[PDB]
Symmetry: D2
Subunit: 506 residues, 4 copies
Amino acid sequence: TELTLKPGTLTLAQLRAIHAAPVRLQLDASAAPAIDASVACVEQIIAEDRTAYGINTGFGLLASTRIASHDLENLQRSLVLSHAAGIGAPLDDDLVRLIMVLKINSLSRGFSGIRRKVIDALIALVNAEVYPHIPLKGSVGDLAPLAHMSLVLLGEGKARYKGQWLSATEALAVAGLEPLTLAAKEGLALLNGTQASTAYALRGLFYAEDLYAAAIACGGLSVEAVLGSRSPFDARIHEARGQRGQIDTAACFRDLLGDSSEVSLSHKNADKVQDPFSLRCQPQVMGACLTQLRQAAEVLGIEANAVSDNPLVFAAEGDVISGGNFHAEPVAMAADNLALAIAEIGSLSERRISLMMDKHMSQLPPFLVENGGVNSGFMIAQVTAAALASENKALSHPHSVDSLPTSANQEDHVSMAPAAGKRLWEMAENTRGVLAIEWLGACQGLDLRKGLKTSAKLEKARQALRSEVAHYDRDRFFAPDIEKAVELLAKGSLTGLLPAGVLPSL
Amino acid sequence: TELTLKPGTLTLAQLRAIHAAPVRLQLDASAAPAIDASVACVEQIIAEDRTAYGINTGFGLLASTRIASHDLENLQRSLVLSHAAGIGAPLDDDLVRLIMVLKINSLSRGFSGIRRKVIDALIALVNAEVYPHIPLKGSVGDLAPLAHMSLVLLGEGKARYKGQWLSATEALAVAGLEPLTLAAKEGLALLNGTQASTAYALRGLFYAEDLYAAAIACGGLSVEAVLGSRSPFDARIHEARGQRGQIDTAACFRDLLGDSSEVSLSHKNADKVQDPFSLRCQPQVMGACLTQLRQAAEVLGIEANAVSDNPLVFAAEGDVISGGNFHAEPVAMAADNLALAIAEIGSLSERRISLMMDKHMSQLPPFLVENGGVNSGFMIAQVTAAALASENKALSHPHSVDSLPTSANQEDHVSMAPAAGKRLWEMAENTRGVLAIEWLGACQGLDLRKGLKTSAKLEKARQALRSEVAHYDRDRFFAPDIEKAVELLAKGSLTGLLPAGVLPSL
Amino acid sequence: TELTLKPGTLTLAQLRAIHAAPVRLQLDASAAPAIDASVACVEQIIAEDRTAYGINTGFGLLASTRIASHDLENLQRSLVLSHAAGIGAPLDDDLVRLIMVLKINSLSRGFSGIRRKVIDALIALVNAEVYPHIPLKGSVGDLAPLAHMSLVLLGEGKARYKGQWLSATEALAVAGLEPLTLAAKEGLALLNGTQASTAYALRGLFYAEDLYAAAIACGGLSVEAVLGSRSPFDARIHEARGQRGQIDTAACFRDLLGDSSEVSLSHKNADKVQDPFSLRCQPQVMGACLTQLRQAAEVLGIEANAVSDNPLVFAAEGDVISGGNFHAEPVAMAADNLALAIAEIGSLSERRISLMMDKHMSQLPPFLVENGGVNSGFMIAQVTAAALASENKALSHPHSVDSLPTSANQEDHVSMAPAAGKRLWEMAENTRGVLAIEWLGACQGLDLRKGLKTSAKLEKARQALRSEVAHYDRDRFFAPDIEKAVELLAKGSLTGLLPAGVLPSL
Amino acid sequence: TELTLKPGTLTLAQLRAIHAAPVRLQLDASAAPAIDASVACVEQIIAEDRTAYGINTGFGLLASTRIASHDLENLQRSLVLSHAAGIGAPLDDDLVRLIMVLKINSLSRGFSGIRRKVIDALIALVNAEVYPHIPLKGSVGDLAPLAHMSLVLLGEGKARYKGQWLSATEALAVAGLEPLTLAAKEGLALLNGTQASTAYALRGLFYAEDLYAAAIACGGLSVEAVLGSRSPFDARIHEARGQRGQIDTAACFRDLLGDSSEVSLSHKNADKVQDPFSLRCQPQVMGACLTQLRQAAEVLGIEANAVSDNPLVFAAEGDVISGGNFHAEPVAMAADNLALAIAEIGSLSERRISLMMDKHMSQLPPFLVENGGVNSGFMIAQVTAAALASENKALSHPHSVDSLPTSANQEDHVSMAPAAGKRLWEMAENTRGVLAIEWLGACQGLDLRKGLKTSAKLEKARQALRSEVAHYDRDRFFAPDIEKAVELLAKGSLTGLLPAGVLPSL
């Protein structure tokens, strides 16, 4: 995707796109005035020998002292090098790309006083698919990971190109660049910000959305497999409750399931008995999850466009002002919010899987297999989904409620947003595994309703799975089937069945 | 407050009012048609010998069997008695009142098939200030607490009147009533619902809001006490970030602090040095908290008006439909959401208190007391705020991520909303204690800036405290001062200083 | 119980006794030498004009300055008053008594330099059953609650006598005392310590033990009610695993159940089928719980006898040394340890209750009631146990992993032991409720095995319950039955059936 | 290391050795009798046409039916294939080796009825350094991972040899084996067990121990760097408290620090002022951690030797008995216990790092760097340690308190031990990072005490670091220094300085 960026206008769908695939971008011409005017403001402050904290000062001792030009420029390098104190596994290229593009976006709104040539250097890196090494951990919400990113601009650190590490000099050259020397305020402009926190949480959101869409299809397949009712999805019920997420959710189920199917019709009377809550309360539970992820997405969509460095430059007035927009508290709470939705999607699916194993509730053979006296069928796959569901409870513990003082008590409250966002990725693997197993069981259960078909989109879901995994006729090595189902989910195999305009970025 | 209820239209401000004080209510005439039509629908189903689950059926064995009229009426009593299996401390009258009014509200929308005379019985109880005993625990989200409430209607259980327990017969008589006998569907109409879950979480919300408002005033007093800057509250900063909660938050700080004060002016140059994050990141942290509580409030305001029983009666079509609107998942997540806001309000305030104890950051005497070599001053009050802040982290653990199967796996996924909401009350006591101590310290610190005044609303806050608690001249028994400050907060002493239309119910 | 205390030798059984009931105590004559020698050491340091931190110094500024005698004595009062900065509900008299006795015990080991007359003042309070007001919260692990306690000695604060609050003067007089004036080091001797942390956690332990014993009897009754097997309790199994808690646990089950009973014999062949894990894995799960609580008890039994103030006086050498024994980290971890045991006792019992509701596993009528089509029986009691079990998961979150800096970063790591211990009390109410419901269901289930008896101790357990709660013949108001069962448990009704020398304090 | 195994006698030191490095083992001749006798018992049951659950039966339907020999042997294969339903990353070879050796150990005690030739097949795999693929997740505590392991024996699955995946046939051949065909009871003997749970938690223990030893050296270096006192380590203090972990801990500090050093002596009077709790309460906090890890180690050392399959064969009596020793509840609690110790080691170290950054407490330059006005020094390294410390709080949430029912409610309470143990590995990376940064800062601080040396073992620790990382003279790229310090710790660089017989496996 080619992108002419109007800074501060990225949509959640564009962000998903940046996250999913390489991008080519350039700044809209309308961005230049504010970018160049905040640089001219910094330039005028220096020209006039005025002192301004975080523009031409030192820190602490010198926080009110106009440093000489010479140490001022050395100070920028010294900040990046000293702040690149992150540790842990390298981020994958997708996430690095996302962080570069959010930083470009934020800087390009023109409140940061950073030269357009430096923004364009980062854009050249993105366009060249050259991605700085950024370690996963260290930020308390994003000095360290942003410093690592910034190292390459200076000819330090290292960067990935076509899946291999290159020296920074080598990587710059790939992008048509040479090492840059930073000017006043540019160290802080690059290092202060919330882009890593935001990127981590956006990834969590996109995964949550992916999982939501898959769960509507899987949940529909399970309803059908156990001869459940469509009545709990009646629009009147959801309208009477009033919750928008549940209303939109029920509408999605109706779209996928339709009014009836050959399976539903062939069991003429399927009401005479009530469906368990893991089926019948899908609109209420999945709806709550949808609301939760929409709340998170509203906050993260705003933050992807935020001016998050410090101090900020207000060239129209001539003012430079020290604030706290680098504090990623709203991102950390958004991430903790997504944790509850990813957890509960998985919880509800696991109880559906357990329903399908139980001969007294499924109207299917025990554990979905013929001749169970000597075949175990799906028994231990349900165990695995139980393990994955359970792990999500502890993982749900919020990180936004913790803080430790830093910078000898000057930076005395912090957000822990990076940790909040990154735990979502594993929570999503857990839930993805649970749904993979649910997908496999419901298709197996429907297969046992010999020759009968479910609805048009749900047959698409059965066919997607059966292209890779066969019916379970008798015990065989189980895990490869789960691996295959998970990979299908990871690739978005079921996402397209969900109606449009339901999920924030879809 | 006198209330002519249009069912389903209660506002968050009305709900706060119902929560805070006795109410007198009657149904708007426009409510009668739908109430009476869903009763007539039930009546027609019975007249016609049709069978309808949850109207004239039994359960399980008999879930598709048209029970005889005789056992049908006995079944209603048997449900209430058997479901009143709650345990723990009695709810206070305020919360009982709130639950009665939400149930009246939900039932009065006319989708429940319950006689108007029974709704009016509950309304007579509320008007008489007669409040059924309801134990705190048992619901997994609200059969037990709603059953306890319903016991009184039948002449069972007990009820509070003017702070004393009365027999149900006695209590009914106080309200002008005699014991009722329930009809078809009315057992389920009263017992299925989410009103206890919702009431518990609304109380959490109102407390969170109370604490938010107090924290803006206390935080402003602390900024002033330590000669902090007003620059971090500049509207331009918050506009550039884009987060609405932070923007509204900063606007509140500006309103209370004003552009300058005698204290700020008398320290001519207060910038030359940067404020710690517990001061300077107040808009970002408190703003995140405001967003979080607005997200919760949107969900709870909808749920206070929801049709949450089962099965629902759609008299316009003649249909009765079993769904799952009793599943309080969105309330449990709303409550878990409020936990993060109450926690983080307290966390940020505690770090402000710790700042004020530190001579190297406060520009005040160590621990805010003269002659510290032999006086301890506020030292151990800060310890107490640290204890209270810390307890909130564990208390933040979400309950919406847990579930246990009930009703022999038919009711196999539940919300745990009651536990989610009720933990908020203690979280709010914790944070209320932290702010009480912050209030005391900042006023003490300002006192040490001899003769100097802060802004008009913040002087109101100083005067409110000093009406009850004196300046700390030398060590004295400390705890009564904290008790007094907490009680002032509990009574809403600082709430009115916050500008209008900021908080959902205010 | 009359107690001649040899300081530092209290047993867990004595501590349970002190906790459960009033005590009369005096110091063994062998305590006087060390008590009086550490006072003489302090006296000699002062006589010789030596300076010693925490003996005749001030703090901070004056932490190395020999304060004049005059301010030295005033400093002791100033510490107690300023440190009595606790808040929250008053502790009950049992816990206050326990804290007084632990403080007496610790001080009476003679490493604290506090006058014997002051120890004897506290002992006179205990003997008089006069209990200082102590608020629940504030300590980060126990300056505030110990200061509150100490207030009465000085004629400040207030105290409970025969359930009513008395002025301190009034309370002192009841005990034969007049207000004391503290000397050098005695402020720190009374205020530094871990006795409140330790008392809170000991209460948790005693409750955990009470619950363990009750769970063996209830679990045995449930095994019998559902025609479970005694084979899983075979000693050979547990010996082969090697875990001592499980071995001791299985031995307890064998003692209560015996080799066979009329119920087991009358179902000749009860193996032909496997018991669910909530029955069959009782030795492994309850055994783990027993190990966990023995680990906690070893640490708490040591701490009940520890010298936990500061600085300590080593009269034999003439040295006074500042250390950190007031840091209650081992207590906080012990309390967090007990949380897992109380949680898992309740978890396992809840799954047994759910088994008994399920006709497909219980060999009993659904929900343990005749004519279930219109009777609900124990259905909603199981819901209540599920609510209580679930709440324990969040409550299990550890507090020992949190800390906030205090005393302007000098006291920069703390334990949070008080919060860790006090949450155990509510966890125990939760689990106590779960077992109460299990007790009721298994007795109901056994009743349905018409005329058949279980083992001798388990019939004792059935009779204990049936003295208060009748068989459930048809739906009736359920909650009073649960209330009655809980109260029986709270009073120790089942504790005596457990064999001796299994539980740390029993 | 060469090992002649006496089954059931593995020590914690042997287990560390197996975990750390390849092993060569053979069974002691004394193992053969019991192994062969339990096989003969199974053989006699079959010879005699007796029926015995889990020996010659089917399951559920057939759980009391003597399956024909033909399907009996096919049933063993069908169990392994169907139970190999794990997912996630492959375990590393060290952990796979550990699990194989625990299974060999458990089986070789002779209560399992499995042929010696099959035990010897596993031993041949270990000796050949051929390690079956085992996925990380799926067990609820260890059917899936044990099934994956067992696949190779049958010629299925895959295995690692010299770091590359081989087909099972290929891997068997490397070890001198051909595919085996399982007999009666051998499917359950291999698949039921707690060895994966136990291996995961043992790894956590070994890491906790490694971290403990490193923290004593780092903590000693920090004491010295900031001119702290040795008095808080006085044996008399710790003896008076009575806690063994703290006593052993203080003894370790005394051994490393000695009575004095050139640094301590050159600051003649270092008392005149009190040390912060992160220094002075090291014995109390680290001691609590030591007790916690010894409690865990006692349980895990027993479980490494336990008979944990089912049903068990008691050949001396001729009895076969179904129990629940596969239930890993004690392992899950042991793992949750280790979480608190790993967390709190890191918490205390982080507060020491923060002390060293603070010029008002360190007696060093701010953030440990010369010319701080334009150099940032260790500022952001402390931020990274704060991030890592914080993440451990959420990670501390216990998994032993959760369970989901499996096997359609027959396996209705489970332990979640695998998740409990595996989270410890990341907690240990977090704490390892914190200590790495503390190591770097204290050595930097000591360097600034120009020319002065600390004690003999602590100079060894300084030299170990300085062999790889230079003094911080001016800002430079920081992260490689932290990487290098972490790798030194990971390799056990500081472990050997700790005195012998302190840590369970050392």
